[PDB]
Amino acid sequence: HMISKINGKLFADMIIQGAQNLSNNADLVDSLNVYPVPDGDTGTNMNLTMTSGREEVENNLSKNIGELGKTFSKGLLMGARGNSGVILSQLFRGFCKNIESESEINSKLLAESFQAGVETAYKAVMKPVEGTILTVAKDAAQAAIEKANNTEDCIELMEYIIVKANESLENTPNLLAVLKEVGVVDSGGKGLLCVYEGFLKALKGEKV
Template sequence: MTIKIIEGEKFAHMLIEGANNLSNNAKIIDALNVFPVPDGDTGTNLNLTITSGVKEVKGQSTEHVGKVAGAFAKGLLMGARGNSGVILSQLFRGFSKSVEGKETINAKDLSKAFEFGVEMAYKAVMKPVEGTILTVAKDSAKKAVTFAKKK
């Protein structure tokens, strides 16, 4: 079985479609937001943050995965809203550092980038709390690594 390669344009498309999906479900995420603080704005904050990241991606060339990831991470950081937005920006800061020199990536590169993003996000939070976006990211990265090893 071959490992599929993701090119910059495809990666940019994935980010944009992910942002669209988040935007379409922001109110549902707001309603789920009860821990650790039931402020009901996580979906809104994530949507505002990711919209800023996508705007930065759309202003860049999309031929190089590392450059797309770097632009996305920069946009997330500049537009981060609330704790969830800051954590999301740190997840992708680590992700982008992991792939910055790569024109294309495969499943193993992608899973390692997820892991590096999780490490960076945990380091950025003074007192990480399990059961938050950090846990979701950590568990997702573990699953991605397991999947990539099978390819």
């Protein structure tokens, strides 16, 4: 029960399950939102952003992952809501750009694509702040790169990404005072974990 190659339909499934899992957790993610203003909308913003990506994907499936990523990417970018939706759309724009000429990817390209998304999002945000979705995504990609170096299995890779992304998210209150004073982890980072956990379900052949 090992996934060594991700084609366009497996990536579509990861997108759909990631979106569904975020949707199911959107009210919780909204309730955590305090930075930079406590306006209760991170989960809705990222839910609607990922739904735009998911809708484009569902209507334009492909075996070729690079083509499927262009479709996903365009959907996010034309529906990005709020700080968190804009960052989410830029993380996956860089991820999808990195694979655009590929028909399927392996664990090392997957890890490199998370890293590529981190670089794109950090450059897109004019004044990046730590303790946020950027930090969680950055720590997830660094873990990806380290683990893919000795693992062909994308399921075991994604498991490890989630463990390290989760530790990063639990640390966000130590980087950003408002998170610590209110007593919450970063809502953007939590929304991103929801998507990553859907990715893992799909890699396992399961539904959310």
